[PDB]
From a paper:
Here, we show that the SiaABCD proteins play a key role in cellular aggregation and dispersal of [name] in response to carbon availability in the environment. A partner switch system (PSS) typically involves a [name] phosphatase ([name]), an anti-sigma factor with kinase activity (SiaB) and anti-sigma factor antagonist representing the target for phosphorylation (SiaC). As such, that study is complementary to our data and strongly supports a model that the [name] partner switch integrates environmental information, such as carbon availability and surfactant stress, to control biofilm formation through the modulation the activity of SiaD through the phosphorylation status of SiaC.
Native crystals of [name]-[name] were obtained in conditions A11 (0.03 M MgCl2, 0.03 M CaCl2, 0.1 M tris, 0.1 M BICINE, 20% v/v glycerol, 10% w/v PEG 40000, pH 8.5) from Morpheus (Molecular Dimensions) with space group of P212121 and diffracted to a resolution of 2.1 Å. The [name]-[name] monomer adopts the canonical α-β-β-α fold first described for the human PPM1A and subsequently found in several other phosphatases. The two monomers interact extensively with each other through residues projecting from helices α1, α2 and α3, forming a compact homodimer that buries a total solvent accessible area of 1392 Å2.
Numbering used by the authors:
A (entry chain B): 409 to 521, 528 to 576, 580 to 663
B (entry chain A): 407 to 520, 529 to 577, 582 to 663
The structure:
Amino acid sequence: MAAAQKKIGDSLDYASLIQRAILPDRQLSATLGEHHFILWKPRDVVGGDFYVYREQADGYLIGVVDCAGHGVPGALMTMLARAAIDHAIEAVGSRDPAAILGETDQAMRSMLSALATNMDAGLVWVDRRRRQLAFAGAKISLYASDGEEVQELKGARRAIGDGDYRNIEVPLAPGWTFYLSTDGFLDQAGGEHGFGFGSRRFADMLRDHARQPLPEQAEAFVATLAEYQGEHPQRDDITILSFRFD
Amino acid sequence: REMAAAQKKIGDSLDYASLIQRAILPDRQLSATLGEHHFILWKPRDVVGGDFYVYREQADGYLIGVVDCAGHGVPGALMTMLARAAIDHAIEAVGSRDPAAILGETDQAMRSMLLATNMDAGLVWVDRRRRQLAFAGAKISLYASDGEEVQELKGARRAIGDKYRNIEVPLAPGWTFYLSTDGFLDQAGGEHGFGFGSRRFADMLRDHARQPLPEQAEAFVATLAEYQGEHPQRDDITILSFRFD
Ligand SMILES: [Mg+2]
Ligand SMILES: [Mg+2]
Ligand SMILES: [Mg+2]
Ligand SMILES: [Mg+2]
Ligand SMILES: [Mg+2]
Ligand SMILES: [Mg+2]
């Protein structure tokens, strides 16, 4: 009998309302408008992926997080990590991504006493006033493109909760689109042999669309994966948070 | 054609999600500091629930409490992660000695992060140095018994998320204290499928209040199992008990 399957589905659908409530959608739309786009597709109804955003007068903090697991266990991690990120932003400010990650790690260790509790994160402080960007990541990269060149600011090879973090500071040039993605989109199986999309198809896709309006890029990226994937099930939670300077 | 493998996947996922929820519980700290001066009864309705409990040891005393978040199952379990972190923030912002201030601050921390979102909580600051207690609750009571009388320090009839004060009380020797969510008192059973209730609960506490707390815990489980019979578990159950002298 599939009556139990209906019960769980209704329970998870309501749990997705809780997980959506912790996402900064409204704030992103109201402050960045079309100078951002969000792609957020959990594998199940609730996932282990989420994203953060904190607007300041002089710039903004923006990031993506992939907590251990997907489904319900991943979604539980997402609640803890969202609160751990808020604590960290309050303890060290929103301008130092490496300090935020260090403090997030500590806050997580403080709440969780064999359990996979590690998490990937890519955090960026966009300092509009001083025209420079600070990035710090644990197994998450910052991709940047002007439609000609594709740069990848690689994150540390260590996940949060196992590592000391450092910021990568780049000049902030106009005409550049930035992309923060979890592994899910790049790991999506598909195509002729069932290989994951990968870093090379991803960098090419970004360069190809980087100069385009971000609402158009978002649509093209969704249609590019839908096409690639075909009949293959979604392998992992997908998140792409994009933002553009001038 | 019956894709039953999905039901296995979800079951294994929930069982692993219960390891995450158990990791946020202060079991180890409670056992290491209170030993047999405490007992915990924690039984979610499903694999994961909306109920949890807190504990924070200080040099001069301890903070102990129970929380019942909106819902049960997975949605309830998501609320517990948020509330656990909101309680940590509140303890850091106002200290672990003012239960009413902790509840106020927990409410604010919850409103900043987030739909039924209200929650019940009963928080107690046990002062060892002043030989007193401070209690504040939102739809949760503090029960006390010496095996003869039963005292109930009632919490506000409003939940955290609607509209808090401390009730200070002296610690007399031979008294056992009990913090329970509504789940045990709402358990359907008996002759007419009625919930256990406050009067059967007070009598149960009085009947066992003189026993070692590991024995009380067992008697409480056997009392509900008997009452419940064939009735399914109606809600998440939590009983956190503590004793001084
Ligand atoms: Mg994950
Ligand atoms: Mg990975
Ligand atoms: Mg992933
Ligand atoms: Mg509940
Ligand atoms: Mg109730
Ligand atoms: Mg309840």
